[PDB]
Every structure is written in structure tokens, then in C-alpha cells.
Homo-oligomer: A and B are copies of this chain.
């Protein structure tokens, strides 16, 4: 059986492409510190400080840590991603499998200036998975702390905390406080290992492709319609303008006037920003000119927002202020970092079905005309969903979030995450882990107070997560060649998606999933 001298598992990273299933396994090495000196702590931010009313919060920061595998590049190598996005229309997860193994718990002490570290063989850790969804589910907010993209990186496990209802910095009566030690957990020593399995609930395949037809162009270019439209309300060419109702059949000449069975997806406008600096207005409109939503007296910037085409044809320089997912390049600052450091994603492929983010949805009439009163047409900046309306969801990326938890609520509309992903009602249960506190020597005379002196301690180990995927094979009679994701053919100082001289891994660009085409 297991013991201090026999390893708890084996390293696995691999991808098994079998028919329609691709099974991706991965493994990393982690280190879990001691957070908050084994304490839960109230954390809050009020408007009495320098903070504003939108930035207030109230919540708790627990000593527990948690594993987050929720980004795609955790599970896919750039070459396995290329096989996926080039050769397949859609993919969805089926089941996953998860393991902790090879647990090394280490005590570390300080004598003057020297440091020394040593195994503690009797120490434990605590691991439970929240499979009844009874805790604040904090995954899916696109926080840092995921497994690294690159299998040779060692990563620090992030601290678990949660927010609760507040009023200002103060808490209200509905505010919940959760004690994570109040669950059953599994305590593991260095010989022990951990495992669980999970099976995804049925979800629509992520549709990875671009339509080969725009929504308005579904017509036959050759044949006229038998339907009529109102072409001309005035007498044409005569010495008088006497109004006369003239009708016409729309056809290849006027295709903007044809009747159509469907409408574009819903529009919620964004502000337009140009990459060229000279064009943008001179002021700071980033927050002020932003598109926000007002909930309970707190203005919240709308990010990334509803899926909407980034820009129209032959304008690549304009992008919606809050609209696009923005990834930073390797080694980029957290605050006020210049444009060249971030990587702006763009949705070109949904221009067909979805309206441009920075432009109006359309035009409606504002008034009832009269012989005296001219007709007036207003702009529709924000448009909810109407019957006969189709749209595309936002695209997933190699760097972006895999799924999200659909909040438990009375109703939702198209419960698909706005960052892109797979909306799940019962998402993969978040896994929590902590170093079991080991006390320093108590006094020899009894004391009621809790023990405030602990041994400085941390643990390390190996974690493996294996997700089975369901692929939708591309079956198409298109004659000409597709567009594929290809690496740059020309020479470069170093390979892309590979280490540099110093060993720093880097991902040069965001890679979306839609290179294939279908008919709209």
C-alpha cells in the first residue's frame, strides 16, 4: 500500500484524438501557502475612504485555497488547439477526472537571518469539493490563479474569499457567513491521494465557424420576389409633387428593400474608440463616456457585453470601449499599461448575424405623419430581443474562460456566458484545499484563549485534470479552400508559443475558435 516512500501517482499530460472524442489530460506542480495565519477575516471597502460608491463591498477572506482549471489553455497545447479549431465545427465537454497526488508538506523556520526548510511527514492537508453548490461559487469571474498554460510551470494556489450583500461598507441582515471547516473534508498525509469524477450536463456545442452568408443576403440573386413594397410616395418627374402611392417588386437591383424572414441579434451600444490616437477625442472618456448598467444605486461598467461585431468592413482601427476581450502580453503591468502590451480580440465572424457594437441597431419612426408634419425617424441604440431574431454567441479563446455557473434564478434569457464559455447550471464543483494548522508549543498552564502561535508551513504536490470532449466533425461541400490558423512562415527571433532565451513562456496572440465556415 501507500506510504512515505512510494509515490501517489504518475505524471500525465497527453491528448487522445479518437474519432469524435478528444481526451485532454494535464498535470502541474503547485504550492499552497498558509493564508491569513489560519483565519477567516471580514474584508470591506466603504465610500468613507477614497473609494467611490460603485467600488464598495463586504465579504470574507478565508484561509482556504482553491484550484482553478477554468481556462482553455490549461487543457490544450497550441498544436492541439490548432487541430481542434481547424478541423471541427463544434465541441463540448463531456466528463472530467481530477487527482491530487504526491503531497509534500514542509515546515520552514527562521533563525536570525538564515532560512531552513524540512519535511513534516505527519502533517496533513484538507480537501473537499463542493458538489452540492452550497458555497459562493467564485469561479467563472476570470480571476488569475489558473493552472499555467505551460506544463513546466509551478503555480501558487489562489486564496479563496467571497463577497456578500452590503450597504456601504456595512453588512445587512441577509449577509451570509460561511465557515469552510463546517463541511466534511478529506485529510491527506504524504502517502494519501485524492480523486473525483464529474460529468457535464448536456450543453449545446460551441459553434466554431463563421457564416458564409450574411443574414440580409439569404435571397436568390437571380429571381424577383412576388411581394411588393412601397417604393415611391410622390409623383416623380412631374411639374407637381402630388403624392401618389406606387409599389414595386424588389429584386437584384434593390435588395435592401426585400422582405426577409429574420432579424439581427439584439443590440446594446458601446462607445467607439480608435487605435489611431489622433482620431479619438481629447479628454478622458474611458469611464465617463462608458456604457454602464445601474443596479441598486451602483453603476457597473458593462464588460465585455453582449456579443456584437467589433467593427464593420474595412475599419480595423475602431473597437468598442468595453466590448472586446483584452488579454495582456507576457510580462505586462497591472495598471495603466500602454496599448502595445494588451492583445485586443476582435469578432469579425459574427458581423453576418450580429450588429456592430459601436453602431445603432436601426431606425424607427418617431411620429405619425400628416400632410403638415414631416415624417421623423429615431435611432434605436439599445434593442432587446424580438421574435424572429437570431444571433451568435461570443467566441471562446485559447486563453479565455471555459464555462460559467448559470445563477440559480426564476428566469434567464439565453443562459450563455457573456465572456464566452459554456453556461452550466451545475458546473464543475469548486475544489478547496488548506494546510491543516499545526500549533506551536502551548503554555504549560491552561488558558482559555485560542492558540495564536503556529508553525510556519506550506505544502506542494502534483495535480491532474482530464477532460473528455465531444466534437462535431466538419462536413461540407464547399469547393474552394477554407481559412486555417497557420503560424507565421517567415523567420523570427524566436518561435511563437515557446520559451525565450530566459525560459519565459509566452503566447503572442489570442486565438479564436472560428475559422471554419457554414451557410447561415
CB distance from A458 to the nearest CB of B (A): 6
A336 within 8 A of B: yes
A85 within 8 A of B: no
| Chain B residues within 8 Å of A412, by CB | 389-391
Copies of the protein in its oligomer: 3
A10 near B187 (CB under 8 angstroms)? Answer: yes
Partner of A441 from B5, B221, B458 at Cβ < 8 Å: B458
A450 within 8 A of B: yes
B375 near A289 (CB under 8 angstroms)? Answer: yes
Partner of A382 from B9, B165, B364, B407 at Cβ < 8 Å: B364
A475 within 8 A of B: no
A45 within 8 A of B: yes
Given the interface pairs A234-B283, A241-B282, the reply to whether A155 lies near B409 with Cβ below 8 Å is no
| Chain B residues within 8 Å of A227, by CB | 142, 303, 325-327
| Chain B residues within 8 Å of A355, by CB | 293-296
B297 near A258 (CB under 8 angstroms)? Answer: no
Given the interface pairs A111-B114, A220-B161, A362-B293, the reply to whether A373 lies near B281 with Cβ below 8 Å is yes
A292 near B375 (CB under 8 angstroms)? Answer: no
Name the residue among A2, A60, A77, A334 with the largest chain B CB count within 10 angstroms. Answer: A334
| Chain B residues within 8 Å of A18, by CB | none
CB distance from A346 to the nearest CB of B (A): 13
A442 within 8 A of B: yes
A490 near B173 (CB under 8 angstroms)? Answer: yes
Q: State A321–B230 Cα separation when bound (angstroms).
A: 7
CB distance from A318 to the nearest CB of B (A): 9
A279 within 8 A of B: yes
B4 near A233 (CB under 8 angstroms)? Answer: no
Q: Which residue of B lies closest to A304 (CB)?
A: B259
A96 within 8 A of B: no
